[PDB]
Swiss-Prot record, chain A:
Present with 1160 molecules/cell in log phase SD medium. This is Kinetochore protein NDC80. It is found in: Nucleus; Chromosome, Centromere, Kinetochore. Acts as a component of the essential kinetochore-associated NDC80 complex, which is involved in chromosome segregation and spindle checkpoint activity. Component of the NDC80 complex, which consists of NDC80, NUF2, SPC24 and SPC25. The NDC80 complex is formed by two subcomplexes, NDC80-NUF2 and SPC24-SPC25, which are joined end-to-end through their coiled-coil domains. It has a rod-like structure with a length of 570 Angstroms and globular domains at either end. The NDC80-NUF2 globular domains are probably directed to microtubules, the SPC24-SPC25 globular domains to the centromere. NDC80 probably interacts with SMC1 and SMC2. Also interacts with KIN3. Interacts with DMC1. Belongs to the NDC80/HEC1 family. The chain holds residues 594 to 642 of 691 of the full protein.
Curated annotation (Swiss-Prot), chain B:
Acts as a component of the essential kinetochore-associated NDC80 complex, which is involved in chromosome segregation and spindle checkpoint activity. Component of the NDC80 complex, which consists of TID3/NDC80, NUF2, SPC24 and SPC25. The NDC80 complex is formed by two subcomplexes, TID3/NDC80-NUF2 and SPC24-SPC25, which are joined end-to-end through their coiled-coil domains. It has a rod-like structure with a length of 570 Angstroms and globular domains at either end. The TID3/NDC80-NUF2 globular domains are probably directed to microtubules, the SPC24-SPC25 globular domains to the centromere. It comes from Saccharomyces cerevisiae (strain ATCC 204508 / S288c) (Baker's yeast). Belongs to the NUF2 family. Present with 1550 molecules/cell in log phase SD medium. The chain holds residues 352 to 401 of 451 of the full protein. It comes from the Eukaryota. It is found in: Nucleus; Chromosome, Centromere, Kinetochore. This is Kinetochore protein NUF2. Changing Y32C: Temperature-sensitive.
Amino acid sequence: IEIEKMEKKINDSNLLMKTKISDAEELVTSTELKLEELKVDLNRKRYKL
Amino acid sequence: DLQLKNLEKLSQDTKEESRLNDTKLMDLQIKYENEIKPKIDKTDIFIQEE
């Protein structure tokens, strides 16, 4: 029972590695894409001005 | 004598399976603590500092 309990624990832990790494990569990419989109918006606004 | 041999084999299998279960649990906890936990630490350090 103890072995299977902390086996479920380590399985959840491995899922946690995968989820945390994916979330970190996704947020970094989202920040970079937001910076690029803001750059495009600002240079278009500058051209309009 | 059959029942005594059964009890002897029961004790032998009991100690064998007990040490097997114990070894499984400590080895897997060691995998969690010395491989998975350092990976947690490295991931957290990479997220925070970098």
